[PDB]
Enzyme design. Structure first.
Site, PDB file in Angstrom:
ATOM      1  N   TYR A  54      18.786   4.702  -4.431  1.00 60.03           N
ATOM      2  CA  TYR A  54      18.487   4.353  -3.061  1.00 60.03           C
ATOM      3  C   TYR A  54      17.394   5.312  -2.609  1.00 60.03           C
ATOM      4  CZ  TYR A  54      20.854   0.554  -0.764  1.00 60.03           C
ATOM      5  OH  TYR A  54      21.179  -0.695  -0.310  1.00 60.03           O
ATOM      6  N   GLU A  56      15.289   4.711   0.524  1.00 61.11           N
ATOM      7  CA  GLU A  56      14.764   4.112   1.758  1.00 61.11           C
ATOM      8  C   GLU A  56      13.735   5.004   2.419  1.00 61.11           C
ATOM      9  OE1 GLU A  56      18.620   3.115   3.733  1.00 61.11           O
ATOM     10  OE2 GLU A  56      17.733   1.128   3.644  1.00 61.11           O
ATOM     11  N   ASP A 208      -4.391 -14.228   1.029  1.00 62.95           N
ATOM     12  CA  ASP A 208      -3.270 -14.227   0.081  1.00 62.95           C
ATOM     13  C   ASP A 208      -3.821 -14.655  -1.265  1.00 62.95           C
ATOM     14  OD1 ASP A 208      -1.148 -14.980  -1.629  1.00 62.95           O
ATOM     15  OD2 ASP A 208       0.092 -15.633   0.037  1.00 62.95           O
ATOM     16  N   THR A 234       1.259 -11.541  -4.828  1.00 59.72           N
ATOM     17  CA  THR A 234       2.295 -11.337  -5.818  1.00 59.72           C
ATOM     18  C   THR A 234       1.737 -10.623  -7.038  1.00 59.72           C
ATOM     19  OG1 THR A 234       1.911 -13.537  -6.781  1.00 59.72           O
ATOM     20  CG2 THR A 234       3.660 -13.345  -5.128  1.00 59.72           C
ATOM     21  N   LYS A 237       2.056 -13.643 -11.205  1.00 58.29           N
ATOM     22  CA  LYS A 237       1.335 -14.832 -11.667  1.00 58.29           C
ATOM     23  C   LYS A 237       0.230 -14.447 -12.675  1.00 58.29           C
ATOM     24  CE  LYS A 237       2.142 -17.262  -7.313  1.00 58.29           C
ATOM     25  NZ  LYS A 237       3.088 -16.217  -6.866  1.00 58.29           N
ATOM     26  N   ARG A 243       8.179  -9.673 -10.881  1.00 63.77           N
ATOM     27  CA  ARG A 243       8.245 -10.439  -9.657  1.00 63.77           C
ATOM     28  C   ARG A 243       8.322  -9.451  -8.524  1.00 63.77           C
ATOM     29  NH1 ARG A 243       8.887 -15.640 -11.708  1.00 63.77           N
ATOM     30  NH2 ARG A 243       8.776 -16.528  -9.604  1.00 63.77           N
TER      31      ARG A 243
END
Ligand code: 8UF
Ligand code: 8UF
Ligand code: PLG
Ligand code: PLG
Ligand code: CL
Lengths: 442, 442
Positions: A54, A56, A208, A234, A237, A243
């Protein structure tokens, strides 16, 4: 108090389905324009115990301790992202925490405009993504049409972004954001003319580049970094990473955007980052910068170009009559078959593609085309000469689709009944598996 | 056209940091209540090529084809999840696509109430999560306080949910959702009393069991499935899965909720699911349903109980004076130090814990407690007898923190200067590393 038995031993059921999935990937001509194949190193990252942490917050401004090695990973990913897209860390910042492209866009849009904020994007049917404000008459399909007030610009009948339409819409609607860069657009984008329209109406320019990121990084297509306020992409691709997603923001054009974007990602939207993703992204970004990867990206376009050429030589119509990038959309109207039918036919011969709307399409159910792409097979070693074969298989599927619609009918339910056991399809599947199964597979 | 060199070879820079992270995890007493250690199986899934597939939509209702093996993984995951929480597929459904806890909550809340919808949750300072509607005077910190209209109910001075207050707030504010299940709440929950308050004002009952999921599955704590409309949970904490989330919805109580939740996850919010997560979740959920995992979960509580007890016997105050679960919140006001200071001290001796607000705390910066939890060390083989040691170390850290605050001052900047080189901390780190470093490590 844990079981350390391997995956095959601990869960045999799941391991077989995954062995099968693996075999299906190995024996397929994958033309899903949005898919690629990750190498072993990227998958090692994804499987790394760093996902236990974790962490954050952001590096050096973490809520928790024990984040010294995580900070190094996150900062390395940021460095290498800025490098890969040839922007200066003084002018551009990047957020590497968005879990996927849709999250990155919702987050980045919220940073810029907020709830009830006005945005403009390309319509789904013309090539826009769902997160560019998509809705239909019946419903607000995307959160980006509901949590924002959205307007959608269309391409012309020939399938090109009509910048006259984009300005007419921007002046009367007055959005804070105009989105460009697309999911099924087969041509390059004039960002300067977008920048010019945004400047006029005092809107942000949002690019994008998820579909074409590699082209942008490798200097083969237009660079939106020279004009855009925000760039999203992303990493799974054409970029061939895990991902995940990256949000890029121009500090010089909009100081204090850093804080807006970073706080939108956390704590507005996300909680703990996924550090395995961040590791994996960082890994692929090293590869993205190598001159070897530029060569792969070049091959992608060389293949796309040759695929487009071979399909035209077989009397198949493409939207815009070709492609500037990795992707092609086939217009199937002349053959009087839907993209949905061809998709099914293609899935039966282990050819993976998706149905896709064209400009003349009113609705998204029963679209009149398919979309194909070269990144996946270019990754598997296929070269220009190999595109004649893919063109040939797609021609044969189209023909078979026509015959089957004649024999069994236009209703999709009926059409599908024709597919199983078909001698020609079984034959064509065989040809596909033989060629695909022997290609390099990461 | 890919590089298949292993991770150590392709990216040495990155491989060393991850080696370092591994060694840090190995040599730490991990008391972050929200953390755990995944086994090799779960990490194999996360590394699997199944993350190559775009598979937008739901099983057998997919937009793309070639999802035969993907459908099987997703349906197996949903089945195994329903089983693990002992609910019938007839009465309950689950969505296994939400990428993390925060996303699942925003998605579930959106499904139920929509933009501008009214929600109630516990305030952050009382134990509530950010995604339960958190805001403060200065800003709407969480999207859940901005895209929804949110109100926050507090715990009483002794740190307990005050249902009288939850009622009074519900009847005047009249929300559509009331959220329970928390991030730093050390006691069990009266879901029935929540159900009776919800029914009274016609709100949904939303239970986020992320911190206590394993207890719920193994019937050790109260079961919100008997009363709740929606149950959300992360898969990466006490459940010991990968980083992902599950949305459960009660079909009998709310016919047509299925479609509402399913369309909220996609296409409203997310795009392509992360199938490696889904496989990994499937893998862990089988383990969750074994009687060996119930023994692990019991050991979590046995350890927490023993740790609470041992801390009380060293004159350390706990909020609610104990715990019903895996977590304890230490009240540090008697020692006149901050959780922020103690955290830094613990980070220097390889003790991982986080600063945490108590009921008396006005503001989230400079909170007066720390949170500790047992799932991580319970995973690493520690038993009740070992908790005295962890209690001894934390007592010694508190002491050292008091002494360092005396010598270098109350400002955090000065305090940290006192940490490096400190002979006692070095001694204590050594003791920590020796005990932790030799524990079982998945
Ligand atoms: C899913 C998605 N997201 N972004 C996208 C798509 C695409 C698409 C196209 N064309 C474009 N341009 O971008 C798409 C969208 C859709 N629809 C049809 C309407 C539906 C609304 C509803 O009934 O709920 C929303 C999704 C179907 C497709 F086959 C595709 C192919 C696709 C993956 C490329
Ligand atoms: C991050 C997070 N999300 N959900 C959470 C937390 C916690 C927390 C507590 N207590 C609770 N109950 O739940 C938390 C929250 C915060 N803040 C401080 C104020 C901030 C607002 C701003 O200035 O933007 C919002 C987050 C600091 C912490 F050290 C913690 C520890 C935590 C991780 C357990
Ligand atoms: C332009 C664009 N932006 C964002 C996304 C979102 O990625 P995630 O699925 O990771 O959220 C997509 C993927 N679109 C689906 C496709 O072309 O297959 C896209 O095409
Ligand atoms: C009740 C609850 N719900 C949701 C989440 C969000 O999970 P993601 O981080 O996967 O978004 C948390 C984690 N809260 C941080 C902690 O307890 O340490 C939580 O405690
Ligand atoms: Cl992942």
């Amino acid at each position: 108090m844990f079981n350390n038995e391997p995956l095959e031993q601990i869960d045999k059921e799941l391991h077989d389905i995954l062995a099968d999935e693996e075999k299906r990937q190995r024996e397929t001509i994958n033309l899903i324009a949005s898919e690629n194949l990750t190498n072993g190193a990227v998958r090692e990252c994804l499987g790394n115990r760093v996902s236990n942490k974790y962490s954050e917050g952001y590096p050096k401004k973490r809520y928790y301790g024990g984040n010294d090695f995580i900070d190094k990973i996150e900062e390395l990913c940021q460095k290498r992202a800025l490098e890969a897209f040839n922007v200066s860390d003084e002018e551009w910042g990047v957020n590497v925490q968005p879990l996927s492209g849709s999250a990155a866009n919702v987050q980045a849009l919220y940073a810029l405009v907020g709830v009830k904020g006005k945005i403009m994007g390309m319509h789904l049917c013309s090539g826009g993504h769902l997160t560019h404000g998509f809705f239909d008459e019946k419903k607000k399909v995307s959160i980006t049409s509901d949590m924002f007030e959205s307007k959608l610009y269309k391409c012309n009948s020939q399938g090109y972004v009509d910048l006259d339409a984009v300005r007419e819409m921007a002046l009367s609607f007055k959005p804070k954001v105009i989105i460009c860069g697309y999911t099924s657009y087969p041509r390059d984008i004039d960002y300067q003319q977008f920048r010019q329209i945004c400047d006029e109406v005092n809107a942000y320019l949002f690019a994008d580049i998820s579909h074409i990121s590699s082209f942008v990084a490798c200097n083969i297509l237009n660079n939106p970094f020279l004009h855009a306020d925000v760039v999203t992409t992303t990493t799974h691709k054409i970029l061939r990473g895990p991902r995940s997603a990256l949000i890029f923001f121009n500090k010089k054009r909009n100081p204090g955007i850093e804080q807006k974007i970073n706080s939108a990602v956390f704590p507005s939207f996300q909680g703990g980052p996924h550090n395995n993703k961040i590791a994996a992204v960082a890994c692929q970004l090293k590869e993205v910068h190598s001159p070897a990867f530029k060569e792969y990206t070049q091959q992608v376009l060389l293949n796309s170009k040759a695929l487009a050429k071979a399909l035209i030589s077989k009397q198949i119509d493409l939207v815009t009559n070709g492609t500037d990038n990795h992707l092609i959309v086939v217009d199937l109207r002349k053959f009087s078959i839907t993209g949905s039918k061809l998709q099914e036919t293609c899935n039966a011969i282990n050819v993976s593609l998706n149905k896709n709307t064209i400009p003349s399409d009113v609705d998204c159910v029963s679209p009149s085309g398919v979309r194909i792409g070269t990144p996946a097979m270019t990754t598997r070693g296929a070269k220009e000469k190999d595109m004649e074969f893919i063109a040939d298989v797609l021609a044969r599927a189209i023909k078979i689709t026509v015959d089957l619609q004649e024999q069994y009918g236009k209703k999709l339910v009926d059409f599908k009944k024709g597919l199983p056991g078909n001698a020609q399809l079984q034959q064509l599947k065989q040809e596909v598996v033989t060629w695909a199964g022997a290609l390099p597979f990461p």
